[PDB]
Symmetry: D3
Subunit: 201 residues, 6 copies
């Protein structure tokens, strides 16, 4: 069958990464996966290539754009990020649900090419709290806070909203959406094709 | 703020009503409730008028039909069942999500009057298990299975499908569908209004 | 071995009583129970004397006051409510934890007679949601909201605060408070006495 | 706001480490953290510096004591261990709940400087069982068993007691204490400051 | 397809019956049920004939014994209790798992007639806690403790042992035993028949 | 006491590995462990020796067989795999429940030497699904599918059956079997020896 494509977006400091990482730890590669994006930003201490991202240089990323290799690409917080079309179409083909961690610009592009992709937006519990999480120079902090408020402007465009106040709760909300989507008729009629045959035949 | 209307259907013995009661005992009345349908069938030991059903006579049921008192109504195995429009509109306007335990016939009439409603169909894990649950004479049991096969055929008309093999597993699937529907933008926009404005 | 006394309070519509009943259905009588208060208010359909309340007449309630039969008592919206001292002392001496669903007035009188008691206050997630839950004429609803705002003002007098936005989330918070109180040294010292001596 | 300071103590072989590690795996760095202590003992296979501990040499640890750099320090099982005051005060300041894994000597020192710190003691289910866990030379085993019995002598000084018989259960007990503490009025009045305003205004 | 018969026993105050009711409220009738025993003891307030027990007179109980109506029967503290063979065989043939809340005496008679049955014995966490739960005059309480110590002595005759210290913990242990028994090859072979053939 | 010996078998692509790995992450080394088997196959990227397996060369494995060092050994998918008898008997002795991940050939050998070992078989939800998981050349895929169908032929020999459709569910089934086994009288009479004494004395 075909897996469902998920778009997950959020301002930095909403917990989106840890939520997605905690999610994957409970799902087998044959059911759920996160997509491997291409980026120009430097790998982070303890972040292997090809796994988290495909780290390429500014020129290398620019030649992929010409090659129309991207399903979408955008400039985010000083670097280029894009979704290799090959991987996404192949993984979805084997029936796997693929998670695309992307900013709102990328989300618009995908909604335009894959109308059935589902989008989830994640909001922090409050401004103060969003601020406390960001801090973890006041000039760089204000820069992240400005980008974070802009990103949140586009929340109403997504199908789902998870307010990540209490971590565990938001992690369950994220699991709950995945499961409810696999309970939809279209996917269930396929997964239980046999049984349905037996019951009506 | 209007609540969502859920349509749940299944052939007898799929475990439908015992899945709903387990769900409801986990939710307060201001969040979720189940509609109390009208019926001409005899009350079973334990059933109380107004609670499980509004048991009426064939004549009375007719009276209500003629006066458009039903959001939907239909005959299910030699008896009538209907959802009084009034009760539903009143509970929906208070923001409560309503569960409608009705057959595939009523489900259709509800889909038209409320295209926003979400419908869930429940299936037994096999025809043998179905048979077992149905048995609770070989003749009466074969006629029950006949009405079930007819119910199960309209399954594709529903948004969600739960194969209730393992009770808890299926109960968590129902709980999951309602939880996910509440995480939808339109619903969330409202209940989190002015948190998004503060942000 | 004496049990802990829990004070739970909230304005009407915060979901207080439906949070307690969900808790109690998860605990045996030798562990947790709820006190059955006395009241002069009319029994609501379903309520049974001795179970939910001990429904008495204004005269009778007065008699008990004059004879110091109440650990605490107060007038809540044109009616009297009180906790008979006797029932409580008897159940507390058997090691059972007791839940007191009472208003901010009774809570105070209980804090003095039992400084060891733990009090939990429950809040609705917003004034709109509060209003919605309260609506269950614009006049009667405004007077209900007025008595709620007055209840919510004494919230800081409580040890714990639960914002009951999502029912299950709030139910697990209550369950969590009672579980954590049982992990306290004084309580644990006793119930694990002679395990610590073996160690 | 200010996060709550936790003291967790236990005789070796009670499971205290694995409980604390399992705990952190479910909490974001912005809510819960374990403090990084200084020690003279050797790092263990697969234990990075600055993360688990700050591994220093005997002389280096001795000069920090003069510098009054420690909130507390003690000698435990042949080595020096201490809590750098800087980190603790800074992390707590950003509202984070910090866990201090320390012996009973350290616990006394902290209770004296931070009267609002909360302490949790963890006991094994029985002596035999404590013994089975220790074993994992009978001369070294008896030495750990003697130190372990001494440590347990000080249990009555802690606010909470978790009997770690069934792991999962003790892990839930440990999560349950953290959550119940964040439900206290003082911390809730701050976290929900806004809402309370709206409801009473 | 025949269901499994579970034997659950314990001394008064171990929390046995409140552990079973919590279990049953989590399972549908086509999966699990509890047998309604016969007894000569007086119905306690709330108990209903046919639901909790089949309350009969000493004469009537005798009549049934003489006519081999009991799969097992025994005297428990000055009264008779028995499991009507008929009800059990009927519910077992429908594939339902049956719970038998009976004493160590009945358990033995059941082990012989159904060697396939699984028996679970429940213990209090200590004699003090046992005493506390039992207290609900020092004389009547000492005689209760005497009958409990005698019950607890036949504990080794059971397949499983649950030390009900923490209610939820013990409830999950019961739930776990039934879930594991259902994962056994013989049971699974059947309910997953023709999935193994497709594979 | 003595821990219980578990045998877990399944055709490749049933999820058996990830289930067992997810299991261990929630159990302390003093309660549950997976046995370290000897094998001739190459270690996999990110798989340390002595931990997952004891990787030896074809000749080295052949000399262990002569030394009767194995409780069982078998040829599986092109390589030799065996269970060192030493480790198993020692770990079980300290009361630990040891998990043996082995094929059906090995399972028969163990059932013959350790009649009280408990065996769990894990089946995929369907043939198609088993196929989807395998794929992750059509000549090598058909080879795994043939071996996988053979392996499944021996399912009826095991005490338990877990159908790993929904991962989380199968993970709970696997936890549920372990716990129910520790609730058996024999093991409980030992674990609660003291209490029982007090209650009947
Ligand atoms: N179009 C497009 N866009 C793409 C693509 N790939 C990625 N993007 C976009 O690029 C951005 C991702 O950039 P990144 O550099 O990969 O960042 P990230 O790992 O996703 O995490 P962040 O942006 O920093 O925020 P986030 O808070 O979600 O992370 P988390 O790790 O949970 O953070 C934990 C939190 O805890 C705090 N914390 C840590 N320690 C703390 C302490 N002691 N006290 C208080 N708080 C503390 C931290 O400060 C942080 O807020 C996203 O906007 C994404 O959508 C693509 O292919 N296409
Ligand atoms: N259009 C419309 N339609 C409406 C409306 N209201 C109702 N309807 C339709 O009318 C029908 C309802 O008729 P009903 O007589 O009220 O039946 P019900 O209460 O819904 O229960 P069942 O038909 O038996 O099914 P169900 O499996 O869901 O019950 P459950 O509680 O799980 O049962 C437990 C199971 O366990 C078995 N069981 C019981 N005891 C057993 C034992 N000892 N051993 C083994 N199994 C045992 C039982 O046989 C049962 O299957 C449905 O098709 C419904 O959709 C309305 O307003 N409009
Ligand atoms: N000093 C003292 N004080 C005492 C003592 N005993 C009691 N009191 C005080 O007296 C008051 C209790 O009065 P009561 O008449 O007994 O009320 P109650 O049973 O406690 O229920 P409520 O006031 O309505 O609040 P609550 O929200 O907690 O109920 P809940 O069950 O969640 O309700 C469900 C919710 O859902 C709504 N709902 C219901 N149907 C709905 C529908 N169709 N759609 C939408 N919403 C719907 C309802 O309106 C309700 O809010 C409390 O303030 C208490 O503290 C005592 O001994 N001493
Ligand atoms: N004042 C002060 N004090 C400080 C400070 N920092 C640390 N300390 C103190 O120093 C001590 C910590 O020393 P450490 O060297 O860091 O030890 P640790 O990692 O904390 O673990 P242990 O002491 O060995 O015991 P624990 O049983 O709790 O660990 P765990 O990993 O769960 O163990 C798993 C268990 O399973 C067993 N196991 C393993 N395999 C087994 C097998 N096959 N069979 C049976 N059992 C098996 C193991 O043997 C072990 O018991 C503590 O007393 C701490 O309070 C500080 O800053 N200030
Ligand atoms: N052979 C055979 N035998 C059969 C058969 N049927 C029954 N029997 C045997 O007959 C006996 C049953 O007698 P019964 O009179 O029916 O008793 P029961 O309903 O089974 O309840 P108990 O004896 O009191 O024990 P249990 O602790 O299990 O109840 P629980 O509901 O947890 O109770 C809650 C606990 O909390 C305490 N409690 C209550 N209120 C309290 C308060 N305020 N404070 C503190 N504690 C309080 C209570 O005292 C109780 O311990 C059992 O030994 C059973 O095995 C049969 O067919 N055949
Ligand atoms: N006698 C004896 N026998 C022994 C001994 N030791 C081991 N054996 C036997 O040797 C075999 C083990 O060989 P191994 O090389 O160690 O393999 P393994 O790690 O156990 O995993 P596999 O055999 O490949 O299957 P499995 O599906 O169970 O793994 P998992 O990692 O869950 O797989 C994840 C799944 O997801 C799929 N996947 C991954 N990515 C996917 C994607 N994008 N889309 C769809 N599916 C995707 C993968 O393809 C895989 O099916 C077993 O048959 C075992 O019983 C011993 O001492 N004695």
């Amino acid at each position: 069958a075909q897996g469902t494509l998920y778009i997950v977006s959020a301002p930095s400091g909403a917990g989106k990464s840890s939520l997605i990482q905690a999610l994957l730890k409970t799902q087998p590669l044959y059911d759920t996966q996160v997509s491997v994006s291409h980026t120009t930003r430097q790998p982070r201490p303890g972040e292997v290539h090809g796994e988290h991202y495909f780290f390429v240089n500014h020129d290398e990323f620019k030649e992929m754009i010409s090659r129309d290799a991207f399903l979408e690409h955008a400039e985010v917080f000083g670097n280029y990020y894009g979704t290799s079309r090959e991987a996404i179409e192949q993984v979805l083909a084997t029936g796997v649900d693929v998670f695309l961690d992307i900013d709102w610009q990328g989300a618009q592009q995908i909604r335009q090419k894959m109308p059935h992709a589902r989008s989830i937006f994640i909001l922090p519990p409050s401004k103060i709290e969003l601020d406390r999480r960001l801090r973890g120079s006041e000039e760089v902090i204000a820069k992240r806070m400005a980008q974070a408020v802009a990103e949140m402007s586009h929340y109403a465009e997504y199908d789902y909203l998870i307010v990540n106040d209490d971590f565990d709760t938001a992690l369950t909300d994220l699991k709950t959406i995945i499961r409810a989507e696999r309970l939809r008729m279209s996917r269930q009629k396929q997964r239980h094709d046999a049984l349905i045959s037996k019951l009506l035949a």
